[PDB]
Design a binder for this molecule. Structure first.
Ligand code: BEF
Ligand SMILES: [Mg+2]
Length: 1003
């Protein structure tokens, strides 16, 4: 059935061959079940571990590490011996690191997926269908419903499938469509057909879409769509069809990996070129194509040694710690790199109903008659706190808490509110929240009566389930509730007959429609003749409440003291209801709205400080949307919103330049379709802006998946939590701001341990290449370089992730999405450091061979030509040949490298802040990890079996002083670089602590 809302009830009944009185037969049931199938959405679940690891290995850095591992493995295989375990130890540990990284990623993904399934009420879905089996209604599962079934639905049940309304058993039918359309107020439904074929879901007032629940009434209709043919099913298909890009952090890491691969391949071909033509010698060869094999084998090994190994491990550790700190704030993050996304977010789009506001109408204002002076009056006004259905808030007259017992008008108002409504407020122990039973605009009055204790009952001893309806129960016990005159659209009010345990008729309705019938005023306990001045004053106050800064749904409450008895009452016709209440006594009025969350007003301001633009994209009308915008702080109370607030059509009828100016300056989009939100998010991203979308409904699912990060509310639909990358399990909007902080800190710290590692490694390159150029004996060998790069470069690089965040971190605009991790300057700035690690280490070794007392004081010629020392005495008159394999210079080089790395982790605490102004004890984890790395290095020296694995031997005090002399100037070098970076001794205890070391070392 196509466009069932455009066709009358008779023809849509005949198209399916179903009679509204009888229903469907089991034959037709099976005939439709075999075609359409089950009425449920296809479940998409997390993939197996293998397909998760496949995407864990999608990072370019992990691919580079795996390529380097395979290369070093096929290079270690050139040796005929298969038992060379010292050569295969490097690819094995690289593979272990990569496998651990992938396992941690998969574990985080699975833990996040499991934490979101707990935010799902395990409720069975049922429906009431009229089939030809039995005459009475049949309660069956909604999965078995097929297009054509007659479905009967009453107040308080979810709509099982798309239903074309055939008959309304009650006078009116009110449905809550906040899930699909985002409307805060319930919609009145009618069986009349809608002429527009391409009408939006809000214009379809004869259809009941799936997932929505009935607020009030009872009706019967015909199913027209099931499964994926429903509206929510179409929205889920549109969500699944949307594309999913890579997070900004993943893009930055891919760019850095491309730069790294360009660097690694550069030094390889450079060494190959500078060493080509150097194998024309006959030694171990004799050809040119054969000469490019040994030099290639050494150059590729050098280039692989240039690559950092613990970088993805420390990145994953930092991201996982960030995810843990966010989950401690009730925020479920699916992916690791999504923790940084809110740090670089420029625009935060947000749904209104349920996301920015609660979905729980609450009375926030009220007023009664305090005094009367003649042709005028005085209005006693109160404001009530509380933005949910929980009866916890308080009432304040002007600014101070007051008791409503002294006021008789407030007692009458509470009586009217508790007796005129037919809704209720229950408590769900499973979710621990209070919920409504009927319409929201009557649960508001129920919670109001529960808030203002007019009888001063004691609710402290009562439990939560009894505290939900205690005061209403007391008021109902005091006055018995007789028949209720049904609400009529012409009279625009509803009344209730009441006889105490004389007769009073309590009327509740629209302000003007009710006040046009009130002829007297209740002031305290006194009846007073009504005049035009009182009327115009009350009407002006209502118009002030009904619009302006506070757009409130207003409700007038009156009483009838002398009504005619039920004997003279005639309830056959609806038109007698208004004439039965021609004379009324105005008691007061109340004003309720869909209140924003209590954490949104400060959150929009904090996001404004951090440079984030908040946009509201909602399906509700522009009135309520702009009201909530002015309330939370997006707009001002008097700010013109002519070119800052749009609708769906008002945005569609704009030219591309107009749409550009809108997306660049608008802040409120109202009455938008689920595809309109995706269009807005796509435009905001087309303007090169990392976009964040927050939502709780199905209509947000196509948008939450389009944004770089999509945040869903913990109470929202399952589709929204499916399309989202973050989930606020506690419906706390302020948490988002907190998240924006972490993604700002983490990334900063990230850059730190991306430099401190990278620079370190290039040092171990300049140490080797120079040793190949000068011809000196090998100072640093890969077996100890692996231990360095892992242990003494992962503990400081991990502790550098705990750096204290900046003081103005949340006071600056988001970072430019175009700038890379390693800039030009920060490139040079590390090259220098790398060079210093190349010149020092080698030098240290040479020192032990030239100037050390214990070492053989050979000449530079004898040092560079140690290959000729194998001969007895060509030029080496007394020096030993075995001494060129001594472990003392190798230990000197290793200790110098480790000490330079410790000092470089020391002065890597901040990018530009000097070590004097920011002492190292600011990050106690950094100094702790430095102590641990030095302790593990000394462990390598003085334990029994490990000094045999690494060709190193312990030192003495003089050689350690020399190591310090060689290594410490790296701090001066980095301080000079930081000074140059800033321009183009605040901590005096640190200075007086380091002066002994400097004077003792350079004594
Ligand atoms: F829930 Be939103 F206002 F579409
Ligand atoms: Mg919503």
């Amino acid at each position: 059935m196509e466009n069932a809302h455009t066709k009358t009830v008779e023809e849509v009944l005949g198209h399916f061959g179903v009679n509204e009185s009888t229903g469907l037969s089991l034959e037709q049931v099976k005939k439709l079940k075999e075609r359409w199938g089950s009425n449920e959405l296809p479940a998409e679940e997390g993939k197996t571990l293998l397909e998760l690891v496949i995407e864990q290995f999608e990072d370019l850095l992990v691919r580079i590490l795996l390529l380097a591992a395979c290369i070093s493995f096929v290079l270690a295989w050139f040796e005929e011996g298969e038992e060379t375990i010292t050569a295969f130890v490097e690819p094995f540990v690289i593979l272990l690191i990569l496998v651990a990284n992938a396992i941690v990623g998969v574990w985080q993904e699975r833990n996040a997926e499991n934490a979101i399934e707990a935010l799902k009420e395990y409720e069975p879905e049922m429906g009431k269908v009229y089939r030809q089996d039995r005459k009475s209604v049949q309660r069956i599962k909604a999965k078995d419903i097929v297009p054509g079934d007659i479905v009967e639905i009453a107040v308080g049940d979810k709509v099982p499938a798309d239903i074309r309304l055939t008959s309304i058993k009650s006078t009116t039918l009110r449905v809550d469509q906040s899930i699909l359309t985002g409307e805060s107020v319930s919609v009145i439904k009618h069986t009349d057909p809608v002429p527009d074929p391409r009408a939006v879901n809000q214009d379809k007032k004869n259809m009941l879409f799936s997932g929505t629940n009935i607020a009030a009434g009872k009706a019967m209709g015909v199913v027209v769509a099931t499964g994926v043919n429903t509206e929510i099913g179409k929205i889920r298909d549109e969500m699944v069809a949307t594309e999913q890009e890579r997070t900004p952090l993943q893009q930055k890491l891919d760019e850095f990996g491309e730069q790294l691969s360009k660097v690694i391949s550069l030094i390889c071909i450079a060494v190959w070129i500078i060493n080509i033509g150097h194998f024309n010698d006959p030694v171990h060869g004799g050809s040119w194509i054969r000469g490019a094999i040994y030099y290639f084998k050494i150059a590729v090994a050098l280039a692989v040694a240039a690559i950092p190994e613990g970088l993805p491990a420390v990145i994953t550790t930092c991201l996982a710690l960030g995810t843990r700190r966010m989950a401690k704030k009730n925020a479920i993050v699916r992916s690791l790199p999504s923790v940084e996304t809110l740090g670089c977010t420029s625009v935060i789009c947000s749904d209104k109903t349920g996301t920015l506001t609660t979905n729980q109408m609450s009375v926030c204002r009220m007023f009664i008659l305090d005094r009367v002076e003649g042709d005028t009056c005085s209005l006693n006004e109160f404001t009530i706190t509380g933005s949910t259905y929980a009866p916890i808030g308080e009432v304040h007259k002007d600014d101070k808490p007051v008791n409503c017992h002294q006021y008789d008008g407030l007692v009458e108002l509470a009586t009217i509110c508790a007796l005129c409504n037919d809704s209720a407020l229950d408590y769900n122990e499973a979710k621990g929240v209070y919920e409504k039973v009927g319409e929201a605009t009557e649960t508001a009055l129920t919670c109001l009566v529960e808030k203002m204790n007019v009888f001063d009952t004691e609710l402290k001893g009562l439990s939560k389930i009894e505290r939900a309806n205690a005061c209403n129960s007391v008021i109902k016990q005091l006055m018995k509730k007789e028949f209720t005159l049904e609400f009529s659209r012409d009279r625009k009010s509803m009344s209730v007959y009441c006889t105490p345990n004389m007769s009073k008729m309590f009327v509740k309705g629209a302000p003007e429609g009710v006040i046009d019938r009130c002829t007297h005023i209740r002031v305290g306990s006194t009846k007073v003749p009504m005049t035009s001045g009182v009327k115009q004053k009350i009407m002006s106050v209502i118009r002030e409440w009904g619009s302006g800064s506070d757009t409130l749904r207003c409700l007038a409450l009156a009483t009838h003291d002398n009504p005619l008895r039920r004997e003279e009452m005639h309830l056959e016709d609806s038109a007698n209801f208004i004439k039965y209440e021609t004379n009324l006594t105005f008691v007061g009025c109340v004003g309720m709205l869909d209140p924003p969350r209590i954490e949104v007003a400060s959150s929009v301001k904090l996001c404004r400080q951090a440079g984030i633009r908040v946009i509201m994209i909602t399906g509700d009308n522009k009135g309520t949307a702009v009201a909530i915008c002015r309330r939370i702080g997006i707009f001002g109370q008097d700010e013109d919103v002519t070119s800052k607030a749009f609708t769906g059509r008002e945005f569609d009828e704009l030219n591309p330049s107009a749409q550009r100016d809108a997306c660049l300056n608008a802040r409120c989009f109202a009455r938008v379709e689920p595809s309109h939100k995706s269009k807005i998010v796509e435009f905001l991203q087309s303007f090169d802006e990392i976009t964040a979308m927050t939502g709780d409904g199905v209509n947000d699912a196509p948008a939450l998946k389009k944004a770089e990060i999509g945040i869903a509310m913990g109470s929202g639909t399952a589709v929204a939590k499916t399309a989202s990358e973050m989930v606020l399990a506690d419906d706390n909007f302020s948490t988002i701001v907190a998240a924006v902080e972490e993604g700002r800190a983490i990334y900063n710290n990230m850059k730190q341990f991306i430099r401190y590692l990278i620079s370190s490694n290039v040092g171990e390159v300049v140490c080797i290449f120079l040793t190949a150029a000068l011809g000196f004996p090998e100072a640093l060998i890969p077996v100890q370089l692996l231990w360095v790069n892992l242990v003494t470069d992962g503990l400081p690089a991990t502790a550098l992730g705990f750096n204290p965040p900046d003081l103005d971190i949340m006071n600056k605009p988001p970072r430019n999405p175009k700038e890379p991790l390693i800039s030009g300057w920060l490139f040079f700035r590390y090259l220098a450091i790398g060079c210093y690690v190349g010149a020092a280490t080698v030098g240290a070794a040479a020192w032990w061979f030239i100037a050390a007392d214990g070492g053989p004081r050979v000449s530079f010629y004898q040092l560079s030509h140690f290959l000729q020392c194998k001969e007895d005495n060509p030029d080496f008159e007394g020096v030993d040949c075995a001494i060129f394999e001594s472990p003392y210079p190798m230990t000197m080089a290793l200790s110098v490298l480790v000490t330079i790395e410790m000092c470089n982790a020391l002065n890597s605490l901040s990018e530009n802040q000097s070590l004097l102004r920011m002492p190292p004890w600011e990050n106690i984890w950094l100094v702790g990890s430095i102590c641990l790395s030095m302790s593990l290095h000394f462990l390598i020296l003085y334990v029994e079996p490990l000094p045999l694995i690494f060709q190193i031997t312990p030192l003495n005090v003089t050689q350690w002083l020399m190591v310090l002399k060689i290594s410490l100037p790296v701090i001066l070098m980095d301080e000079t670089l930081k000074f140059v970076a800033r321009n183009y001794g605040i901590s005096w205890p640190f200075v007086l602590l380091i002066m002994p070391l400097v004077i003792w070392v350079y004594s």
